[PDB]
Amino acid sequence: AKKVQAYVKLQVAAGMANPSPPVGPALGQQGVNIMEFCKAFNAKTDSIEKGLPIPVVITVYADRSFTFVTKTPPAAVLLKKAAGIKSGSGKPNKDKVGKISRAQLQEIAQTKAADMTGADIEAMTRSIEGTARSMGLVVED
Amino acid sequence: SRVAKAPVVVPAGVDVKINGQVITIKGKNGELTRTLNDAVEVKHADNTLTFGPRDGYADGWAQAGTARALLNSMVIGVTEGFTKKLQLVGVGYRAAVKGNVINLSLGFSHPVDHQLPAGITAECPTQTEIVLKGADKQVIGQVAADLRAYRRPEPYKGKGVRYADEVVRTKEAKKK
């Protein structure tokens, strides 16, 4: 949409109301009331069981305005939400633990298909196979 | 070259006096003349000025490459002018214009009031901002840089006299 003024996509798990210090600056860019971004998203945050980093983007406007785009959580954390542990990448090509087939990957891609125009089904399938091999995970169908 | 692909277009309102090597430009508010070197072949051809490097001085592509940039600035300097603003950041430091003289509240035991030459119409909107106006690009810097050299930008506070567009690099104490 917009241009060289501001465009950063950063939001982490929305159970924490206070802007986490490293996220702070993406809210510390164009003069927000930080209570506004706390009161914008919580009307829909009560339709979730919190625990995963959900992303939003920030985008700005002239006087004191701003805007933001809501999407669904990415499949990268959805790989390690089902797998139990949040960080598995210790050795990529030397660990063979943990299987999920393609059927789980497409049903977490329909929620991408019902939300976004990129991150398409069949193209991300090798990169949701590619985030498996870097973590040291296996896949069979 | 790039300079050979750069001719300058004199407009109406600035008259040239081509006595060969000595050109005295009769302009809007002054007389911006430069007595160039003999490594140039000058001709106000139709309206757009064309130049040339003389033989023997084949390094005159440099010596007239100065000149192509030179006279372009002269015809636009005698008419429009240069705004050369300076930013006075000093504890108790003021600036005020009277006639052609500038005060210098410069933290000394005695005042410094230096008279400024022709080609200068100076102004001061406040104690920290000071206009300089002029016709030559050299004289609009030379009288400006002398003030700045009396109190250089101090890189521990940001103290000093500094230009409008100049951005200092102030450091931190880090010991005590």
């Binding site: 206070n18 | 504890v91 108790g92 931190e172 104490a173 005590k176």
Partner: protein, 556 residues
């Protein structure tokens, strides 16, 4: 009378930073060097001052012609300041009844009992320009002890009945105890102020908050320096309630069968703690008792004395005070101090582990050459739960050293376990295993294996890099602006184990875990980071280490 001294800037800077409502009165005439007039705006009169004299003239004139319009636009904001002070001046700002000098102050004096506006005045103290002007506002804008709510003694514990007592001489006596200085003449002194009532000379003045009996001696007034004996203390004087046996911060000075106060609010915490050490051993006899008359003066001066090392560990809120109380000891208390470091638990641990160190013993002490070439193996510092700091795992090869000579080798190791090859830092809590104990008959005794074990233990430390088991304090720091990023980076120079950055309405409170061994000049360093703008807490939580690597070369 200085450059950059804009009067109208600073009073209109309070409305931006302090957020208050100042409406100033005495304005400025002069370009700060030829400055001659201070513009009082109620009476609209400028005041002439001394040519250079220390105080001749007070010559009042009109408003000068060089400021005839700035007096116009600023007087109309003065006479605003009573229409919104009292509701009754609202209809004569607009109706146009005259706003005289005497009428407006009757509203504004009642605007000092709620304190929404402060009254500002420009001038010079040192150039004698304004000091004679500044006194007339004090009797008309600063409140009197009989115009204020007076002494309000509540009760004790029965019921909350706050009772406004009288400001005149017709009440039971009442005072308070503060600024309780000392002297080598009578001992304790006070700078106390009586609010109402009259006392005679000689009284059984108690301190009714701490249940003690005192008698009222010879009271003395000062010119802030010189002894002038004030016999009869009237209601409102400030004097020296002398001869109090025990007295604390802010308790009552009151006759019995009278109202009684019990109030001590905001007891401070002196934060920076430095440990004073004597010069001679005759000094500690007089520096052990230094706490007596010194800490009795003020609660911004504490001594956190240890339980073991018996050194005197002081505590101040500023080192700038911990300057002065050493200089208070210097020429009058006649003390030579050696100010050093506080008692941090310095329990030498071990980074490296020595393989085998043999104590070389060979001496014909008892007739035949009493030998004793015993060898010990440096075992890792015993961790977890180990109440005994001495964990000698005597591993005699086949029970070769007899029970009689077991104390021998034990003593040697124990002696160097309590000692330290750096600055006598106990290598305690360090489990030590005996490798092999050489045993003899006529060459076996106590020294035989004691002396050997002593050297053996020390030898090992030289090739074992003993570090420093250290206590870790929970250190919080409160800093308002975005200048804490330089702090927490400089805190990262000192192993401040970070917890999180949190905010308040005005402050950004940082949470960290800092080694107590890394305290040193923490106070003076943040005071050059925070510029002194910091107000925070100090607690304790974990226990970690601090780099030493001294065995390499520093340790002989």
């Amino acid at each position: 009378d200085r450059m950059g001294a804009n009067f109208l800037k600073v009073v209109n800077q309070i409305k931006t930073r302090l957020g208050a409502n100042p409406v100033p009165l005495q304005l400025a005439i002069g370009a700060e060097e030829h400055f001659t007039g201070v513009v009082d705006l109620v009476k609209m009169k400028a005041i002439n001052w001394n040519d250079a004299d220390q105080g001749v003239t007070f010559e009042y004139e009109d408003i000068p012609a060089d400021m005839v319009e700035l007096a116009n636009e600023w007087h109309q904001n003065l006479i605003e300041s009573a229409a919104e002070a009292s509701e009754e001046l609202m209809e004569k700002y607009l109706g146009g009844e005259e706003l005289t000098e005497a009428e407006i102050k009757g509203a504004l004096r009642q605007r000092v009992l709620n304190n929404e506006i402060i009254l500002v005045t420009c001038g010079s103290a040192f150039k004698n320009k304004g000091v004679q002007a500044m006194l007339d506002a004090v009797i008309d804008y600063l409140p009197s002890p009989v115009d204020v709510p007076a002494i309000n003694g509540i009760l004790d514990d029965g019921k909350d009945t706050p009772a406004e007592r009288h400001a005149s001489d017709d009440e039971p006596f009442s005072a308070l105890a503060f600024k309780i200085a000392t002297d080598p003449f009578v001992g304790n002194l006070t700078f106390f102020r009586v609010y109402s009532g009259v006392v005679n000379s000689g009284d059984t003045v108690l301190n009714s908050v701490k249940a003690a009996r005192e008698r009222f001696g010879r009271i003395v007034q000062m010119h802030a320096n010189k002894r002038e004996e004030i016999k009869e203390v009237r209601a409102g004087d400030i004097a020296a309630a002398i001869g109090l046996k025990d007295v604390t911060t802010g308790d009552t000075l009151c006759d019995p069968d009278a109202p009684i106060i019990l109030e001590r609010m905001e007891f401070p915490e002196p934060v920076i703690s430095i440990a004073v050490e004597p010069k001679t051993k005759a000094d500690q006899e007089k520096m052990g008792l230094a706490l007596g008359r010194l800490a009795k003066e003020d609660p911004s001066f504490r001594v956190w004395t240890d339980e073991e090392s018996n050194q005197t560990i002081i505590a101040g809120m500023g080192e700038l005070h911990l300057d002065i109380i050493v200089d208070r000891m210097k020429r009058e208390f006649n003390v030579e101090a050696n100010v050093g470091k506080p008692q941090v638990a310095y329990r030498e641990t071990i980074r490296q582990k020595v393989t085998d160190v043999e104590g070389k013993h060979a001496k014909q002490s008892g007739g035949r050459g009493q030998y004793g070439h015993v060898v010990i193996d440096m075992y890792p510092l015993e961790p977890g739960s180990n109440p005994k700091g001495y964990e000698f795992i005597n591993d005699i090869k086949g029970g070769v050293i007899p029970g009689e000579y077991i104390p021998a080798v034990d003593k040697g190791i124990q002696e160097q376990l309590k000692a330290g090859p750096l600055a006598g830092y106990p290598v305690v809590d360090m489990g030590i295993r005996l490798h092999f104990g050489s045993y003899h008959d006529v060459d076996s005794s106590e020294l035989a294996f004691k002396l050997a074990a002593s050297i053996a233990f020390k030898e090992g430390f030289k090739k074992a890099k003993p570090v420093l088991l250290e206590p870790i304090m929970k250190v919080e720091v409160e800093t308002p602006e975005e200048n804490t990023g330089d702090v927490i980076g400089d805190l990262s120079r000192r192993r401040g184990m970070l917890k999180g950055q949190e905010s308040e309405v005005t402050g950004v409170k940082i949470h960290a875990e800092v080694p107590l061994s890394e305290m040193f000049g923490y106070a003076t360093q943040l005071r050059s980071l925070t510029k002194g703008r910091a107000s925070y807490t100090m607690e304790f939580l974990k226990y970690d280490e601090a780099p030493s690597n001294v065995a390499q070369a520093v340790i002989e």
